[PDB]
Amino acid sequence: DIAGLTPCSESKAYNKLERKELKVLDKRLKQYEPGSAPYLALQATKERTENRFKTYAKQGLLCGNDGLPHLISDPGLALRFNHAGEVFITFGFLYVAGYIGHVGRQYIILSKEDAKPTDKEIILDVPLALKLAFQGWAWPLASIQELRNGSLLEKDENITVS
Amino acid sequence: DRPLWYPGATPPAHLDGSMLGDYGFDPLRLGTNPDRMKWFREAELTNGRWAMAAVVGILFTDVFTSIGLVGLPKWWEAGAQTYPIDNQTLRTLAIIEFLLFGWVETKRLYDLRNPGSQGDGSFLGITDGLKGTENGYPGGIFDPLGYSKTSPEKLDELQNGRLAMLAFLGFASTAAVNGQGPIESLQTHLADPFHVTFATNGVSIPHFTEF
Amino acid sequence: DRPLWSPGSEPPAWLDGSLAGDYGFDPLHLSEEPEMRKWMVQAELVHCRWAMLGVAGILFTSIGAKAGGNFPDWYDAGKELQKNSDIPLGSLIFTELLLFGWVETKRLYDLRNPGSQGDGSFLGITDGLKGKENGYPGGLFDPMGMSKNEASFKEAKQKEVKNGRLAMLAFVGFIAQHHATHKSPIDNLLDHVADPFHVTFATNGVSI
Amino acid sequence: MKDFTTYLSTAPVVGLGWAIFTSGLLIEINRFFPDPLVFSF
Amino acid sequence: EIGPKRGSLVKVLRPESYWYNQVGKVVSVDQSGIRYPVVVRFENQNYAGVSTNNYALDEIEEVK
Ligand code: CLA
Ligand code: CLA
Ligand code: CLA
Ligand code: CLA
Ligand code: CLA
Ligand SMILES: CC(/C=C/C=C(C)/C=C/[C@@]12O[C@]1(C)C[C@@H](O)CC2(C)C)=C\C=C\C=C(C)\C=C\C=C(C)\C=C\[C@@]12O[C@]1(C)C[C@@H](O)CC2(C)C
């Protein structure tokens, strides 16, 4: 009940929308036999809709004036209340993104220490790429240990015109 | 130095050098840098040293609790039962813990950067006794059993510490999928060894085969 | 100089006839590289051994079921043997996976590092636990000293490959005749000899 | 055989190995686990 | 004789060249008193497509 919003568990617009979708899906049930493939498909879609509304609700998710769930993003404001899960868990993307970056940077540096590193880019060295992909699980430790040693950057060896 | 974690085809690069509990296990090659290796061994020593005290504080009390000697709560609710007593302070334990712990943690920190950097003009009169022998291995702290000639006692220390770390991870995971204690989950494993198993007792892996 | 898989054809360059059960049949050029050949030979040997054990077990339980015992057929055997069992699924699955992880990991590292597990690591076993050939271990898996004679070991290796290939070719046939007749393999064999002219693969509705 | 396995390292290793793996992983995750709008905390 | 050793990697110091602050291998050094005798060769091509150029003696520095 922050930023003027209300929990999805006590909102009339949320229930109104839920019944609307359950009704528009149920209107298509009369056009088919009670035991065929379109009937089974429509029944599976109805079960998924009921489960999603139940899953979206009772999990601290709150909506505002229209039944649509809103998301709290300020840390602290999302930590003082049970709203950390909605967007404060940015560390999942940061982990996968840093994993991709560390694997690519390790492949660029290692491949450059070879005669003509070009054809190694158009024709990947798959045993070296697979070995470097499964070796970068602890990428933040390698990043902090490669920064203190100064092996992450260059001093002044850049094609500049400044 | 000690037996390899695998029987073959796994030759490390920076693990050839002598070290305490050297088993040659480093697949991600994290300790390639010498300074980072020297810092990671201290981190492993501190983590194992505190995990040992934590696992004995949980397991040793759980033995008497399951037998019936004491009426103390389990570890997952020992915190929820200490503060409801009438004579127990508020949540100031975290602050006094942070202050009194940071005071000695910074001494141990400045000792790693500059080994034996405890000058005479720092403490009152024990300003000379804090000169540790090696990094992570001091002398004036411990009083007996340490003036021997052969160091592989540290191997027992490191092996007990690694087993303790793995044990605490099992304590936090077993009590997260079953809601019981370690010996409470161990005693039931002795009764039915095929029924209470992580593959089928707790919701660990999605096994849905109920034909 | 040796009988080939296609009389009149020519065998490849990387198949001289020194391999166990060599016949020169490799049209898709697989196992041309030395490492790929080293991996493919072990894959064939492990497949031959598992196929021989599985076919022998299927024929044993099928013959016992035809004789009168309480044995289920080869197909749907796991369904009716799990409903009345105290061993729970999932636990049994991971128990099998846990034991097979240890065995197959030691066998894999024996292939990448030939003669490496026999170094006193696993409970102090030095003489055994070290293979003699590519996919032919020794020391512990040879109770009878039948491998200490090359003149008989070569012929016995040839017999193992030629029997395993027929066994896996038979296992593929077990699935086909089951899916085509919904009967036991020993029931299909006894029904074929009862009427070799009328019943066959062409008079069963399916596969026409 | 060496030429075929080296041919398989140009454009398929990046446009059909990773693409098929990543697409199949995200699709199977969204298939067994239905539609995820929060960390379910 | 006046230029650097033939075959030694050098660094370019011409502030308006495509290989500024780069490392190039010296292929030959002329001994006729010309303005730009040190001829170098670089692994990476320029915007035009060439990979070699000749610099003077003052705009050539040793690598790092
Ligand atoms: C050496 C430590 C150790 C020991 C003795 C045990 C023992 C036990 N565990 Mg546990 N566990 C451990 C570590 C350990 N665990 C760790 C580190 C984790 C986090 C991944 C877990 C997570 C876990 C869960 C989720 C569950 C158990 C459960 C159980 C009980 C049934 C066995 C089972 O289901 O498979 C065990 C599952 C594992 C993941 C352990 C296998 C791999 C470990 C880490 C290898 C270590 C073994 C060691 C090398 C050899 C044994 C040493 C011992 C003789 C001292 C059993 C008494 C189940 C239970 O409570 O039954 C109701 C259960 O649900 N464990
Ligand atoms: C239009 C201009 C242009 C073009 C044509 C290219 C083209 C290329 N760039 Mg480039 N680039 C450009 C502009 C351009 N760039 C610009 C403006 C910049 C900024 C200055 C860069 C900076 C840049 C960098 C930093 C890099 C490239 C790289 C590459 C190469 C990528 C090869 C690849 O597919 O990646 C790889 C794609 C992948 C998906 C690799 C993942 C492989 C997985 C892990 C293998 C696993 C698959 C598995 C075995 C299959 C099993 C599946 C099974 C389950 C079915 C490629 C030839 C990269 C390179 O050098 O290649 C290595 C490189 O790192 N570029
Ligand atoms: C793994 C290689 C790699 C790495 C480590 C980086 C890293 C970086 N890039 Mg970059 N980039 C790459 C590839 C890479 N790039 C490629 C291939 C392109 C051409 C499409 C670009 C085009 C690009 C632009 C236009 C810009 C950057 C910028 C940046 C910086 C800002 C962070 C960012 O994420 O921007 C965004 C990065 C992208 C949008 C590229 C995403 C495409 C994927 C991730 C690249 C595929 C890499 C491949 C799989 C690696 C092969 C693995 C190997 C095992 C075979 C950062 C240092 C920004 C900058 O200038 O610095 C501040 C910027 O403006 N990049
Ligand atoms: C391993 C050898 C082998 C043997 C001994 C048999 C034997 C038999 N099969 Mg069978 N089959 C086999 C392989 C084999 N099959 C394979 C690989 C397939 C998959 C294509 C099939 C698919 C199959 C079907 C669908 C059916 C049978 C049926 C039968 C029975 C009647 C004969 C018939 O009409 O089959 C048909 C003959 C063939 C399909 C030709 C297969 C020839 C393969 C390549 C083996 C040849 C190797 C070797 C020369 C023969 C063995 C030597 C010696 C032991 C005789 C009979 C007892 C029928 C049955 O169930 O009886 C009621 C039935 O309908 N089989
Ligand atoms: C059906 C015919 C066909 C098609 C549609 C393509 C299409 C493509 N080729 Mg290929 N090629 C073909 C035939 C074909 N080729 C043949 C016969 C050969 C000779 C064997 C080659 C040899 C060849 C080489 C050597 C290369 C290509 C490359 C490329 C890609 C252009 C580069 C780019 O996207 O920017 C670059 C993209 C980035 C820098 C960012 C990296 C992230 C990317 C987007 C992830 C990779 C996913 C992939 C491109 C998308 C799916 C691919 C699709 C085929 C399913 C492109 C998608 C280049 C390539 O590998 O792509 C990198 C390249 O190096 N081709
Ligand atoms: C046939 C087979 C492989 C065939 C491969 C062929 C022809 C390949 C041919 C070629 O490659 C060459 C050579 C050269 C290439 O250039 C070209 C081609 C043309 C590609 C494998 C079978 C391999 C078959 C195996 C390994 C079977 C094992 C069976 C087991 C274990 C049984 C388990 C049971 O569970 C059941 C099923 C039922 C339960 O009731 C009972 C129990 C016993 C529990």
Supply the CATH number for residue E7's domain: 2.30.30.50
- Domain ranges for chain A, please list them: 1-162
Q: Does residue E64 sit in helix, strand or coil?
A: coil
Sheet of A69-70, strand order: A6-7, A62-63, A69-70
Q: What DSSP character marks residue E62?
A: E
Tokens 């070796």 -> residue: A135
Sort strands E9-12 and A69-70 into parallel, antiparallel or unpaired.
Answer: unpaired
Domain that holds residue E21: 1-64
What is the resolution in angstroms? Answer: 2.8
- Whether C170 contacts C55, CB under 8 Å: yes
Q: Does residue A121 sit in helix, strand or coil?
A: helix
Q: Does A157 touch chain E (CB under 8 A)?
A: yes
Ligand nearest to the CA of B159: 1
- Whether B167 contacts C56, CB under 8 Å: no
DSSP letter string, chain C = ----SSTT----TT--S-STT-----TT-TT-SHHHHHHHHHHHHHHHHHHHHHHHHHHHHHHHHHHT-S---STTHHHHTTTT-SSPTTHHHHHHHHHHHHHHHHHHHHHHSSS-STTTTSSS--SSSS-SSSS---SSS-SS--SS-HHHHHHHHHHHHHHHHHHHHHHHHHHHHHHHH-S-HHHHHHHHHH-TTT-STTSSSS--
Q: Which stretches does DSSP call E strand in chain A?
A: 6-7, 62-63, 69-70
Q: Which residues contact A5 (CB under 8 A, 6 or more apart)?
A: A62, A63, A64, A70
Q: Whose CA is nearest to atom 5 of ligand 3?
A: A101
Structure tokens at C60: 């044993």
Structure tokens at C179: 């899916």
Q: How far is CA D30 from CA A52, A55, B52, C122, D39, in A?
A: 13, 15, 42, 44, 14
- Whether A159 contacts E22, CB under 8 Å: yes
Structure tokens at B170: 């099992």
Q: Which of D32, D40, D41 to mutate to test the interface with A (most CBs of A within 10 A)?
A: D41
- Whether B49 contacts B140, CB under 8 Å: no
Structure tokens at B119: 């000058």
66-95 of C, contacting B, C-beta below 8 A: 79, 82-83, 86-95
For domain A1-162, give the CATH number: 1.10.8.110
Contacts of D13 in chain A (CB under 8 A): 124, 126, 129
Of residues B9, B194, B198, nearest to C109 (C-beta): B9
Kindly give the number of the ligand 6 atom that is closest to the alpha carbon of C77. 40
Contacts 24+ apart (CB under 8 A), B66-72: B66/B181, B66/B183, B66/B184, B66/B187
Is the alpha carbon torsion for C191, C194, C200, C204 positive or negative? negative
Technique used: cryo-EM
- HSE at residue B193, side-chain half, CA atoms within 13 A, is 2
Residues of D forming the annotated binding site?
A: 28, 31
The answer to whether domain D1-41 has CATH 1.20.5.510 is yes
Of D15, A42, C55, the C-alpha closest to C63 is C55
Of residues C82, C93, C116, nearest to B7 (C-beta): C116
Tokens 């060439």 -> residue: E50
Of residues E18, E19, E21, nearest to A156 (C-beta): E21
Residues of D forming the annotated binding site for chlorophyll a?
A: 28, 31
Superfamily of domain B34-191: Chlorophyll a/b binding protein domain (1.10.3460.10)
Ligand nearest to the CA of A98: 3
Query: In angstroms, rounded to a whole number, what is the distance separating the alpha carbons of residues B109 and B199?
Result: 43
> How far is the centre of ligand 4, averaged over its atoms, from the C-alpha of A28 (Å)?
51
Q: Which residues contact C147 (CB under 8 A, 6 or more apart)?
A: C132, C136, C138, C153
How far is C-alpha B119 from the chain's CA centre? 31
DSSP element (H, E) containing E61: strand E60-62
Query: In angstroms, rounded to a whole number, what is the distance separating the alpha carbons of residues C188 and C182?
Result: 10
Of B164, B133, B149, the C-alpha closest to B45 is B164
Q: Phi-psi category of C68—alpha, beta or left, where left has phi over 0 and alpha has psi -120 to 50?
A: left
DSSP letter string, A47-66 = HHHHHHHHHHSSSS-EE-SS
